[PDB]
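Work package 3, deliverable 3.1, input record:
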Amino acid sequence: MTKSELIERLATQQSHIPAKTVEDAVKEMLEHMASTLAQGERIEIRGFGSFSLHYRAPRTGRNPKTGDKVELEGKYVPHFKPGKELRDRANIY
Amino acid sequence: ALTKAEMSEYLFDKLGLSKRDAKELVELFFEEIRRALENGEQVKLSGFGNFDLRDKNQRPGRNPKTGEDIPITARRVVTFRPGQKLKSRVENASPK
DNA sequence: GCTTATCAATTTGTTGCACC
DNA sequence: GGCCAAAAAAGCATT
DNA sequence: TGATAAGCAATGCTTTTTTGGC
DNA sequence: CGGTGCAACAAAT
């Protein structure tokens, strides 16, 4: 399922809301989530999961294609931790 | 931390949605993603990232406290692979 | 190729958010 | 809603 | 904690998805 | 609108 397909499904279920608004709402929520992370703040939705930032120390990396060294600066990368309801529902075993 | 309440209020301010429709929409949004993953489907949100399913086979574990070697049952887990656009946006961020 | 994440069990303290 | 072409983003290689 | 699984540095080419007008 | 109880959280172990 892609973002547009998600919007299509939500639209159908939220018949009282104009398809357009649903699409605008989804785009808005995703930006609010991205923006929150860029501000270095976490996200915590009970029953879905939480998003946090993980630090990566600076390091001498490589261009995997040529093998040339590249100096990389410290940084932060998004990280998702799925919630209980989501873990259970997703686990078919 | 960003919460559903905060997301709801934001839709209210930014799109003028009723505090009722806004609240329902946020919840339906997360539920719809859970449903897809629950039905073994991948979720790809361009500009953000992907929620992928991975099947794991039992592997060696233990009790972190005691140490009793207990196995990690096989299982299907949800993972998230942030996209490049989102990764670039938070690389130089700083924990607030 | 090397770095980071997954996970096990239990206790203790915090919080999203359903409910009133 | 679809159809279209251009742009954006992701996917691949290998990551 | 410790065996095991997942993710990634550069980047050009390909493929998928989105965007905006009809 | 705001107050409360608590499973879902985080983090230590």
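The radius of gyration of chain A is 19 Å.
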